Amino acid sequence: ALANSVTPAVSVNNEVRTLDNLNPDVRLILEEITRFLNMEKLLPSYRHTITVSCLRAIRVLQKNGHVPSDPALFKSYAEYGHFVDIRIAALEAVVDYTKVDRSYEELQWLLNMIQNDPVPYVRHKILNMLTKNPPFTKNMESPLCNEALVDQLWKLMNSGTSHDWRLRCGAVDLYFTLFGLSRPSCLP
Amino acid sequence: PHTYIKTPTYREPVSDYQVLREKAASQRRDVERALTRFMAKTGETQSLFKDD
After folding, report:
1. Which spans are transmembrane here (chain A)?
2. Among B29, B44, B49, the residue to mutate for chain A (most A Cβ within 10 A)
3. B21: distance to nearest CA of chain A, Å?
4. What is the H or E stretch that residue A104 is in?
5. Which distant-in-sequence residues (6+ apart) come within 8 Å of A5 by Cβ?
6. If we measure between CA atoms, which residue out of B49, B50, B40, B38 comes closest to residue A27?
7. Minimal Cα–Cα distance from A83 to chain B, Å?
8. Which terminus of chain A is more exposed, N or C, with fewer CB under 10 A?
9. Which of A149, A158, A142 lies closest to A101 in space, CA to CA?
């Protein structure tokens, strides 16, 4: 409910979002989610439901112009040793970031995590979230439509996902969502 | 009365549910804020903002 109340901020001349030019409304929200996340670090919930809700709310505040658009927090919560709900919430935030900020290195981070993660459910979920919220569609001109990305995703369909039968269908779905049924257009 | 008078009365207790809810709420919020600031200052820390 605190995350639902966040309206987009009135940035002037692309002003850097710092602590002093914060909204007086959003400072209370940010204090509350900081208190909740830190108290979850000491007294945890049943399935880290407050971690998932606070990561989702930090992504809501980053989607508007309130918190700086930095994926390092979600990249630290998406490591292997965390609970799987925290991991998929953080990876959902990283997928949303690499859709909005057109990040090349975050997409390479996600594709590397698809290739070598210990939990295969997390790999399937990353392919699923990158299909649902794709970094670009076939209609879009994006900076991320190289021949290098077409070769990486074709290598991920062909080899690489050969051991799961669910990662390979997810890679086929991702290639269909990104490049369509015909020849990838952004290619010689 | 002062010559030979004594009134052994008690002390009026607080039955105000509103101010008791406010006191318990604010004391719980303050002790959890103090605890989390102490634990974030004496350990490894992160920050949403640069050098915060």
Report:
1. none
2. B49
3. 19
4. helix A104-115
5. A25, A29
6. B49
7. 19
8. C
9. A142
Residue with tokens 């070598």: A116
* Resolution given for this structure, in angstroms: 3.9
CA A168 centroid distance within chain: 21
The owner of tokens 């997409």 is A107
Using CA atoms, how far residue B11 sits from A143, A188, B8, B16, B21, in Å, is 76, 90, 10, 15, 21
Closest-CA distance, A55 to chain B, in angstroms, reads 12
| A129-140 b/e (C-beta count within 10 Å ≥ 16 → b) | bbbeeebbebee
Residues of B with CB under 8 A from a CB of A: 32-33, 35-36, 39-40, 46, 48-50, 52
Instruction: Calculate the alpha carbon distances from A134 to A39, A53, A161, A184, B36 in Å.
Output: 34, 22, 19, 16, 38
- A76–B46 C-beta distance less than 8 A: yes
Place of tokens 């290619």: A187
Distance spanning both ends of chain B, measured CA to CA: 67
